[PDB]
Amino acid sequence: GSEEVSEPGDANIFRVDKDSREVYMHEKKLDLTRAEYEILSLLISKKGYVFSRESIAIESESINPESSNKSIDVIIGRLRSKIEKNPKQPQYIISVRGIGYKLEY
Fold this sequence. Notes:
Elements: E1 9-11, E2 14-17, E3 22-25, E4 29-30, H1 34-46, E5 50-51, H2 53-59, H3 69-85, E6 94-96, E7 100-102
Antiparallel strand pairs: 1-2, 2-3, 3-4, 5-7, 6-7
DNA-binding region: 3-105
Organism: Helicobacter pylori (strain J99 / ATCC 700824) (Campylobacter pylori J99)
Protein name: TRANSCRIPTIONAL REGULATOR
């Protein structure tokens, strides 16, 4: 017996998977890309709050426009796509117009 070349890690309410490149919350599996993981990881580490274009641009930050109108659009689109294709779906995330999307701990 021996350990994998790509073991997962974790903190408090959430976990990182390095092999598939994903993030697991106590409620649900989420699975964009490393930067979107980094934001949602930080979001559960601080608090659910309202997850917003600016704050998103501050924590993922691999994106050229700091107003993040296309990052939030990709992030909402791909979050929806993963939770529509997989049977796992949200209940404590709520969409809030162009301001962002609300969550609580």
